[PDB]
């Protein structure tokens, strides 16, 4: 897996949505997913914007192989956009 | 002045982390202050808001519940944090004027919430705030 070739053991996840209920549930599921697999969570935080878009940032640290696997099988609600970096 | 507004904005974010992650408030506080750029933040006041909302959550929400048309857990997460911050100030902070608490809440609901959020937040505070502060000052 890519985790062994990763200098920074971190999964950074950015969410965008028009509906704050959907973005809050998506964020909750990401956190639950991370913790069930024994990873830790930094954030999540909401970012200010002057538009009708809601923004969330969450970092998953000390991930395990099952974390990556579980994140890659996770379905987000339509209306929620995602960006994932294994930076 | 502005430093105290920045503390509120940071408290919204940090309180959001605490609601979603269910990490220890003290770890939330430490990590926020360590990682984020808080150069313009009234840090002491940030800590007192965090502590102030975290140890009194059920009491603050209690000042609010009669005025929601819905269950507490149906409220948006950001909405919940902003309101908790405002209600903490109204009930626990005499060094914050009535108008300041309400207006700062309105501005936070604008930055961090939906189009209509500030109107909901203001609606709740219009009912709740006079009960906490009858003379409205
Ligand atoms: K810092």
From Swiss-Prot, chain A:
UniProt xrefs under Gene3D superfamilies: Ribosomal protein S10 domain (3.30.70.600)
Gene Ontology BP, a term: ribosome biogenesis
GO MF assignments: structural constituent of ribosome; transcription antitermination factor activity, RNA binding; tRNA binding
InterPro entries: Ribosomal_uS10 (IPR001848), Ribosomal_uS10_CS (IPR018268), Ribosomal_uS10_dom (IPR027486), Ribosomal_uS10_dom_sf (IPR036838)
SUPFAM superfamilies: Ribosomal protein S10
SMART domains documented for this protein: Ribosomal_S10 (SM01403)
Record has ATP-binding as a keyword: no
Assembly with partners or alone: Part of the 30S ribosomal subunit. Can also form a heterodimer with the transcription antitermination protein NusB. Binding of S10 to NusB is mutually exclusive with its incorporation into the ribosome. The rRNA transcription and antitermination complex (rrnTAC) consists of RNAP, NusA, NusB, NusE (this protein), NusG, SubB, ribosomal protein S4, DNA and precursor rRNA; S4 is more flexible than other subunits.
Family: Belongs to the universal ribosomal protein uS10 family.
Function of the molecule: Involved in the binding of tRNA to the ribosomes. Part of the processive rRNA transcription and antitermination complex (rrnTAC). The complex forms an RNA-chaperone ring around the RNA exit tunnel of RNA polymerase (RNAP). It supports rapid transcription and antitermination of rRNA operons, cotranscriptional rRNA folding, and annealing of distal rRNA regions to allow correct ribosome biogenesis. In complex with NusB is involved in the regulation of ribosomal RNA (rRNA) biosynthesis by transcriptional antitermination.
Protein name in the entry: Small ribosomal subunit protein uS10
Source organism of the structure: Escherichia coli (strain K12)
Originating gene: rpsJ
Curated annotation (Swiss-Prot), chain B:
Binding partners and assembly: Monomer in solution. Forms a heterodimer with the ribosomal protein S10. The rRNA transcription and antitermination complex (rrnTAC) consists of RNAP, NusA, NusB, NusE (rpsJ), NusG, SubB, ribosomal protein S4, DNA and precursor rRNA; S4 is more flexible than other subunits.
Keyword RNA-binding: yes
Coiled coil: none
Protein name, UniProt field: Transcription antitermination protein NusB
Any single GO CC term annotated in Swiss-Prot or TrEMBL for this entry: cytosol
Native species: Escherichia coli (strain K12)
Purpose: Part of the processive rRNA transcription and antitermination complex (rrnTAC). The complex forms an RNA-chaperone ring around the RNA exit tunnel of RNA polymerase (RNAP). It supports rapid transcription and antitermination of rRNA operons, cotranscriptional rRNA folding, and annealing of distal rRNA regions to allow correct ribosome biogenesis. Involved in transcription antitermination. Required for transcription of ribosomal RNA (rRNA) genes. Binds specifically to the boxA antiterminator sequence of the ribosomal RNA (rrn) operons.
TM regions (residue ranges): none
Domains: entry comment: The N-terminal region functions as an arginine-rich RNA-binding motif (ARM).
Keywords in alphabetical order: Ribosome biogenesis, RNA-binding, Transcription, Transcription antitermination, Transcription regulation
Disruption phenotype: Inactivation of the gene causes cold-sensitive cell growth.
GO biological process, one term: regulation of DNA-templated transcription elongation
Stated family: Belongs to the NusB family.
A GO molecular function held by the record: RNA binding
